[PDB]
Design a protein around this ligand. Structure first.
Ligand code: KAN
Ligand code: MG
Length: 268
């Protein structure tokens, strides 16, 4: 029998979600199982669990980000440059590969959306505007990004059937780690600026692996290895949400652990 909102809310409370919390979810809907009214049921449950003073932050990205098409070029290739749609935060769909729940989150009434087309973040709650801006090219997941503010805002990472590789916030640890050999990428995104499409080319840390040994396409990347180690070494509330094994992680703690983990393994 499909899970009801009420059942999910009680499960979230059992896991340690409290009214007022700042939560970043990572969800496998297949692990959760059928929901009374589909994925919206879990969105509604998350919003009810954090309450009217709580906040939700999600990494939603963009279905049509021209990342691969512009990667490694000093400018968007001509055919891309001419016809790609500008990123419109009000209308651009979420990237399906990071979770089907994210399109439900970003279309929720009052949801705010960050301006970085590839790293785009969606937030619901009284602090949503403060969370989502600024979000500039060159600051995808590190200092000055929504993740940086989430980490200063008592953020909790709510992993609902998701693996250790899913913990986006650990890209912050990669950005700030004082280690040699860090990989960077260059790409171009089409932004809206006063109603006009403007191509912006930037470099940033490689979010597919901060060092060569973490950058195999299949992984494991550093995020995965850090989070696996962390979860083997830390008390973290665990329990079901729907049918999914779930965990509620203190974001500042896991990111601090990850900075230390990288700096202990790689020379400065
Ligand atoms: N490296 C191993 C990891 O790879 C993916 O996760 C990474 C995405 O690939 C990145 O996405 C970027 O690169 C994609 C592929 O080029 C583009 O499509 C996309 N627009 C870009 O934002 C994202 N920023 C960080 C995320 N950790 C898998 O999901 C994850 O399970 C696995 O551990
Ligand atoms: Mg508040």
């Amino acid at each position: 029998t499909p899970w009801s909102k009420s059942e999910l809310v009680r499960q979230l409370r059992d896991l340690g979600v409290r009214s007022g919390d700042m939560v970043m979810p990572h969800v496998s809907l297949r692990a959760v199982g059928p929901l009374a009214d589909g994925p919206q049921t879990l969105v509604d449950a998350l919003i009810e669990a954090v309450g009217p003073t709580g906040n939700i932050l999600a990494f939603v990205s963009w279905r049509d980000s021209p990342y691969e098409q512009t990667l490694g070029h000093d400018a968007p290739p001509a055919a891309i440059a001419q016809s790609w749609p500008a990123f419109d935060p009000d209308h651009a769909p979420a990237y399906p590969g990071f979770g089907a729940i994210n399109e439900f989150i970003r279309t929720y009434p009052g949801c705010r959306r960050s301006a970085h087309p590839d790293a785009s973040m969606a937030a619901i709650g009284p602090d949503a505007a403060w969370l989502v801006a600024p979000h500039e090219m060159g600051a995808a997941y590190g200092p000055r990004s929504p993740i940086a503010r989430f980490l200063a805002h008592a953020g909790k990472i709510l992993s609902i059937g998701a693996g250790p590789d899913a913990v986006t916030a650990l890209h912050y640890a990669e950005a700030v780690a004082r280690i040699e050999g860090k990989r960077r990428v260059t790409y171009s995104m089409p932004l809206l600026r006063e109603g006009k499409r403007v191509w912006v080319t930037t470099s940033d840390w490689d979010s597919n692996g901060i060092l060569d040994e973490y950058a195999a396409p299949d992984g494991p990347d550093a995020v995965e290895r850090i989070a696996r180690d962390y979860l083997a070494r830390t008390r973290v509330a665990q329990g079901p949400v729907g049918g999914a094994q779930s965990r509620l992680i203190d974001a500042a703690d896991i990111v601090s652990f990850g900075i230390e983990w990288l700096e202990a393994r790689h020379a400065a």
